[PDB]
């Protein structure tokens, strides 16, 4: 049993059942979502949120990946949660061979590249991480990618709007994904990487259906699974590691 699914709001399960069924007609009855990111960004919390139960560890401070599989009515979602890819402000190459080792003989259907919304810049390290992922998995992982921005409930401090701040922050990271993967114009706009927002804090405003809602009113956990279901299905080739 997927026990976390009975603890979702009534309207979140209505939508999840509707998205899993839309896959079960392309004859896909399972999918593998890899979760990659720097430490601190909320990768483990987004897994706990998606699964609807506390299944991976949550911390302000390693070491092996953990696969989390749940089945609901003929459909299997496997989500791999990884160590942070960063340490001492340098790309951690060991955490990357551990993730690489756990993925040999697996088919990755979606990558969720996770970062925080609530951050004012991107640097060399952010690009060093994009490049290490490209060198590990191939430029093709970015055709199966979602940019997932946690802390979505943040309020920019400086008299500057939520949509101005977040479209700048998104633009930033997508431009860093492009440069770091050294993809050409045509290849980059034809992976057309979507940006989805996450609010994992228990402090998170609910909408009128008890769904964890973004500042615009939308149940972010349905938005995330619609988007996952879509990359899993966009008919770009999936990433088999061997």
Ligand X SMILES: Nc1nc2c(ncn2[C@@H]2O[C@H](COP(=O)(O)OP(=O)(O)O)[C@@H](O)[C@H]2O)c(=O)[nH]1
Residues of each annotated binding site for GTP? 40-45, 59-61, 151, 199-200
Q: How far apart are the first and last CA of the chain?
A: 31
Read off φ and ψ for residue 112, nearest 5 degrees.
-110, 110
Pick 115 or 191: Cβ nearer ligand X:
115
Q: Compute the distance between CA of residue 107 and CA of residue 67 in angstroms, rounded to an integer.
A: 13
Does residue 45 interact with Mg ion by CB under 5 A? no
- Length reported for the chain: 242
Q: Compute the distance between CA of residue 108 and CA of residue 106 in angstroms, rounded to an integer.
A: 6
DSSP 85: S
- Nearest Cα residue to 108 out of 239, 237, 241: 239
Does residue 52 interact with ligand X by CB under 6 A? no
Instruction: Give the CA diameter of the chain.
Output: 50
Binding mask 78-117 for ligand X (x = CB under 6 A): ------x---------------------------------
34 - beta bridge partners? 80, 111
Does residue 44 interact with Mg ion by CB under 5 A? yes
Q: Compute the distance between CA of residue 160 and CA of residue 236 in angstroms, rounded to an integer.
A: 38
Does residue 65 interact with ligand X by CB under 6 A? no
Does residue 183 interact with ligand X by CB under 6 A? no
Q: How far is the CB of 203 from ligand X (least distance, A)?
A: 7
Q: How far is the CB of 220 from Mg ion (least distance, A)?
A: 19
Q: How far is the CB of 80 from Mg ion (least distance, A)?
A: 11
Pick 65 or 222: Cβ nearer Mg ion:
65
Does residue 46 interact with Mg ion by CB under 5 A? no
Pairing of strands 107-108, 239-240: antiparallel
The dihedral sign for the CA sequence 165, 169, 62, 31: positive
Q: Quick one: which of 151, 162, 172, 174 contacts ligand X (CB under 6 A)?
A: 151
Instruction: Please choose, out of 3-11, 18-26, 35-43, 227-235, the segment that lies near ligand X by the rule CB under 6 A.
Output: 35-43
Does residue 180 interact with ligand X by CB under 6 A? no
Pick 90 or 184: Cβ nearer ligand X:
90
Per CB under 6 A, residues contacting ligand X are: 37, 39-45, 58-60, 84, 150-151, 198-201
């Amino acid at each position: 049993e997927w026990v976390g699914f009975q603890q979702f709001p009534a309207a979140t399960q209505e939508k999840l059942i509707e998205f899993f069924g839309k896959l079960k007609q392309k004859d896909m009855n399972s999918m593998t979502v890899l979760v990659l990111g720097k430490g601190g960004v909320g990768k483990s919390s987004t897994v706990n949120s998606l699964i609807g139960e506390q299944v991976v560890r949550v911390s302000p401070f390693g070491l092996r990946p953990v696969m989390v599989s749940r089945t609901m009515g003929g459909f299997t979602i496997n989500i791999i949660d990884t160590p942070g890819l960063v340490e001492a402000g340098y790309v951690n190459h060991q955490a990357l061979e551990l993730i690489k080792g756990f993925l040999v003989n697996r088919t990755i259907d979606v990558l969720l590249y996770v970062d925080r919304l609530d951050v004012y810049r991107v640097d060399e390290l952010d690009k060093q991480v994009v490049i290490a992922i490209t060198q590990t998995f191939g430029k093709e992982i970015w055709c199966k990618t979602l940019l997932v921005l946690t802390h979505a409930q943040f309020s920019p401090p400086d008299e500057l709007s939520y949509e101005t701040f977040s479209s700048k922050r998104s633009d930033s990271l997508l431009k860093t994904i492009r440069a770091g993967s050294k993809m050409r114009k045509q290849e980059f706009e034809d992976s057309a990487i979507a940006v989805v927002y996450a609010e994992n804090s228990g402090r998170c405003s609910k909408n009128d259906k008890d769904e964890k809602a973004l500042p615009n009113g939308e149940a972010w956990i349905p938005n995330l699974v619609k988007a996952i279901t879509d990359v899993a299905t966009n008919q770009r080739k999936a990433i088999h590691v061997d």
